[PDB]
RNA sequence: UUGAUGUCACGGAACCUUUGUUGUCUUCGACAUGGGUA
């Protein structure tokens, strides 16, 4: 016990020796800290034996009389725990106890260094909240730099103080904040001092040599051992040094080694360092960044979580888009570029808070098979933050569908928006077409365009539509004209031959545009007059199947504002009181034709929380995904206004969101029909009545579009064209 | 040539200002400079010092005028008088030269392209823009241009945070200055025109100037036409000279609390006697005299001067006292700096939208009434005495910040829509429902007439293991009172027909009384209610209405608001789609049948009454006055409920009371919140359903050796009285979220905790060891029977066994009143006692029902009034609400003495410092203490002992946590924490201290009050034959202190303490009933030295309660034995035990045990087992050395019939007795020699004559 | 003390976590004085 230890130390005390005084002070401070925190040791209710001698010794010791050594030892005791929570709480305690002692004017170098290191570690341990770095982290690094600066005001060549200062400066540079003052001068004072054999100073030495053109340390850097646990850091630093030494073959070999041996979580700084290295090599005109970027993308694409069929999940990384921009430009083959572009579509990326929320929902829904994997991902991401500082390194694929599966009477069109290329002043857009009835070598084409004006017009139309609803038909017309003017190759008849339906696979904001309704500049012709159209969220969802066999229909409606004449008083069965129970029964019934005319509400933070508004209940899309014994193979679905209702406003041009279309695609639904924006009730009634009256859906949609576009063109009515426009088909049955 | 135009702007609210920066930093890459662009500016006369004045630039006014002109043009469909207006130009080829660009969407009213770049004429809008200087906007400055020392001379800096919605905690903030409009209400400038501007352009400029409604973050109207240091030094010097340095913090707190009024100085408390000899205010001149003259001085006569004087003294004393510590210095305010500014992007796309020609403004007016205390955090860095502080204006008035009101509106709108907004600072505006609604809302800043000082509450933290307050856990918080009324105003400019449905629903929620608007909402702070609401709609699309609005400036000054309020209509619209609130109210009713107390040392020291402990009282704002009322703290209630919830739940085998709860996700954290989250339940203060005044109860500590009152602080408390016949009713409510009410697990946990609290296991308030705060029942309402569902054999007890004590009583000899019981020389100590953090397995928790029956006249005087029957004093039997009672402290002490003697524990209460009596440091101190013996006594020299009385007994038998008796002074180690270890025993706690507790450990037994169960039977008939509830008087003989020198004759080392004093049972009260003396037989005469009392007779019956928790089988066996001793033994209780008064007997009748949280069992069929286990434990400790047990049984042997022993003290000499008995003078040189005295006094029942 | 064809800062709640608790019968009999004596 603390009292027993104090008694033992007091028994053998020498007033001229030092070690006795340090031990006695350490025991007293330990007892006082144990008194500070309400631990279980407070139940001890004894005193000290030999009262006169003990009192005399205590009085003499207090009259004669380190804090810094004790708190240092506490710090190294903290620096080898297994749990980040334990490390964090211990660091909080250490900082809280050291504040006043350091604030005292006559503070010592050991005390100030300990506090600075504690601040640096706590700043490193901070967690993310949203789209930007926390401010507490930056303030912690600033505090560490302030402590090092006050130490360096008095003393000049403190190795550890200079190292901590440089670590804080480099981490600030890694964050959005720019460098501090005198950074080059300090980096020059430490370069002059000497050479340390540490992974976490090799970065500083690499920066110094790359800045001041001094390759003296590269020999020592390259001649390091290979008996460590973070071998990828050695491989990357050796590759950089060899590149400074022009030993390009060695650079390459270290490149494949580093890419082959890499960690899982993206919180490790290794991935950011790799991306920075690739960008530097590209800027320096060395033609091996292409192969390095290709291999890095190939390694990186396999990190994802499978929830539900045809749906995948991932954790957010800032530079993934940039890396996928660097790999796309590196690739030369058109088919490989198409694969790289398709690697991003139909994928959901979430943050720590969203992952925790979905884990809680799964726990409430009793899904161990998913909860365990979520906990593994969360704890891995949490633990992989300070692995570089603490010298630790804790430890699938999917099949590819050949492009030859397309029929002989179809054309496939892919899209991809290269943000980095657009920022470089070039044409960021890319249209990648494919043609089955041509020579094997000449079966692919690459077309480029600019999308800045199109994005501006889309934003203007979206703002107007949100503000005044129907008072934006002219803006929609302008948007369609902009689409046609920005992609003129659709109307040349040599790239896309006549009588050949097209299959659109958009990427980014192009999902929410009517590409099938492009207007060519009073003679005006519409795109749909020449070819039909289909849509797919991604190419890897391609899986043709036949239709159903039994004949039946079902209607699920929660719309009291409008009564659908033909739909209700017709051939299909009517269920006005549509509850979640009856909805589940309908999905499990496997009908031939299904309709769902209800409302919805979006969710901008968690995509899985978007709700369908039913009678006295709200059914999230996640609940739709997690339904047992679902039978919908080879069945058509007509949907309603909910799909257009639960779409959040777009913010970034390369953003994507999941909806009921994807939810029903996960159930292998034969087809889906839905609108892009708020549809009209009477037009919905007429169109769906025609669609259920006939069998084929593509022919129905084409004939209906021609029938009503005749009436439109008879008078040039933008308000009517606004009603004709929002209609499309998703899926590809047999 | 040009023409000038004077301009003046008058703010209706405080406006924000930015800090000075160097010209090098004044660029577009500086985030702070870019952020501080819409505020005012500070100009320095010279850049060395901060002397200067503020100003406003003309560019901001130009931008505001342009925005107003655009709004007017879209309202008017692009026409001024006869000329159409082009949409203007906002495109620049060289963007790098522009410090700031436009992010909002420009308004659209026409389809024509802008004018040509080079043209001979321009539209009025283009002329106003300046595409041809046409219009020049000057700088706005104060009239006369005065100079101030710095920015802090006109305003103060305030922190403004951003609160996360999902969690409920802020992670970043920013700072800005604030200047009050009362002192700095107006600025003036000029506008110059080039004498060629069209009349249409001038009309548009005038209309835009009138339409501009706010600037610099405030609403505006634009028209065109030193004894404290000395006193602190004196007080500190006096305290240092008198060595009373430990009371500095308490003195500072008292002096600070005196700021309420100067009349409190005249009514400072006094000592018990009534003279000016207080332990705090008369340390010295004296502190009382210093404060008196300070209040007397003419310059401090003023109230504000007195207030600032008291605050300065408190701060100075606090800073002086802070440095006296000698250990680790912890800091609780840490790791909060998260300053962050928005970053407006420069690559933003340019957009244009058409909102339409329809526009309506809806005005809403009312009040905001504070139903509970509120707390708006605003901590000043210079004032360090108080931890948490509130926001006040420069004239010391409460404030209701627009920032807080707007944030609460945004939170409520998000709650209604059920869709959090994840927008980030910078970029184009967000386009969600909440942001769209909030973009058109305007709110005002209010203040109150009430300007009294704030009231401050203290808070602590309880150690779950030892049961006492945690070490170094004390902090205080300022709280504003309840009942303050703030004016309320709200304007919504939008295109919708009336207000939105979401706003209507939120306003209805506020009207119903769910405006949780302030901080500290967990402890029930800041609930408001909207009342006297009025509203109207104004259609600005109409030409005449728009012209009237522009002419009257929209009625924002008071002179227009007066007419607008006349035009207003009473009521509020009902919503179309109403959604229920997120919180539900639960009512609480508590019934208490015992006294109650909630300590507050600051009020105890400040109040005129000299009581040590007082109850908590809070003030209510009645207009511009205050009204104290007694209540129970919401913090204390929350702590009790949380402990009850935690102590019965476990996580992976670990009780929740042991976990750190830092970054935790346990049931307790999810329900009650944590540092990283917000709680889901809010507690409010409870108020009694009456206005009962406090009473006064006084106590005393009895020395175990002398038998008199130890020289301790005679203490008293002021609880609120209660009785079984007149219980205390306590009422209140707490709020619970709907999700918690839906969660079955949380409902079950809360129900279990409430059931345990209702069963009577968790007392409320302090001093519960003596029966204070016993909850009789508890119930709740308004939960739809979801939590109250869980809030829902008698064999004859064995009789006592016959005693074995045998004593021979002759009928010729006279005996002595008291004898000593010599204890064993072995005490069984233990270092670690049982913990309070859970209900340990294998231990028993339950209740005991006792039954006390009187056998001899009992006296328990009521000392509130010392002249009941008419110098000569008089007293009456203890009564409370006209009901005869016995306090629980008397029974606790009576049982504790016998338990200590049985278990052979330490002397629990003892006077170690007393020194008896009959160059080096030893000689002088003996001389200094000798003069006080001569100079103070009611009645060759003394033989002063060289050692204190504490050294005259075995070290094992001294108190465990005692005083310092060894040579040397511990005053050196006052600051250092190791002082306590030099006072405690090296081996731990004895069995008595384990059960009844000590100063650093909580006990495990609680004693309740006792009630008489029948009509009283008085010893003497009363004055009124028709009043059987009052008795007559009886005159007792003289009573005097004991003399310890009788049991310790000489100073030789062979004399030691003999043991514990005990009194015998006899029938000498018969002579006291008559007028005869006990021993001389003469008549007792009235004198101012003796007393008169009211006494009961035999046969009366009482009954009381004992509660215990975590007791082993052997511990409970000995406790029951100490109550029901034997058949033929009796206790002693009350006053005048030496004369025979006050022999009682206890009889146990029922024992009930606790099995789990719901099921209780009758434990009457296990008393023989516990008694057997108790005796076995004594055998192993003492095999056959059990002689103190039988000596105790001899002294407690009650005489039977056919026996009448004669017991009385001897007289001094043989010349003063009619009976011819021996005397003290001849007994000393007789059988009672010095070398044989101790042997005689140790044998029970031995005669002296 | 501003600079001009471009300022949503009424674009941001100082927010979140801690029982003034613990220990005490309003109790009661031996002297007091300096020398006395020599
Ligand atoms: Zn113009
Ligand atoms: Zn928003
Ligand atoms: Zn917890
Ligand atoms: Zn003890």
Author numbering:
A (entry chain B): 3 to 67, 75 to 404, 409 to 534, 538 to 750
B (entry chain A): 1 to 132, 146 to 238, 260 to 318, 327 to 834, 840 to 917, 930 to 977, 1230 to 1250, 1292 to 1540, ...
Article, verbatim:
The type III-E CRISPR-Cas system is a newly identified bifunctional complex with nuclease activity and protease activity that holds great potential for RNA editing applications. Here, we report cryo-electron microscopy (cryo-EM) structures of Desulfonema ishimotonii (Di) Cas7-11-crRNA, complexed with or without the full length or the N-terminus of TPR-CHAT.
DiTPR-CHAT consists of two main components: the NTD (amino acid residues 1–65) and the CTD (amino acid residues 75–751). The TPR domain of DiTPR-CHAT spans from Cas7.1 to Cas7.4, while the CHAT protease domain is close to Cas7.1 and Cas7.2. The NTD interacts with Cas7.4 primarily through hydrogen bonds, salt bridges, and nonbonded contacts. Numerous studies have conducted functional characterizations of the residues that interact with the crRNA in this region, highlighting the essential nature of some amino acid residues for pre-RNA processing. Importantly, in the TPR-CHAT bound structure, the crRNA-binding region retained conformation and exhibited no contact with TPR-CHAT, indicating that pre-crRNA processing is not mediated by DiTPR-CHAT. We found that DiCas7-11-crRNA specifically cleaved the target RNA into two fragments, and the presence of DiTPR-CHAT inhibited this cleavage. We found that the affinity of the DiCas7-11-crRNA complex to the target RNA was reduced by the presence of full length (F) or NTD of DiTPR-CHAT but unaffected by the CTD.
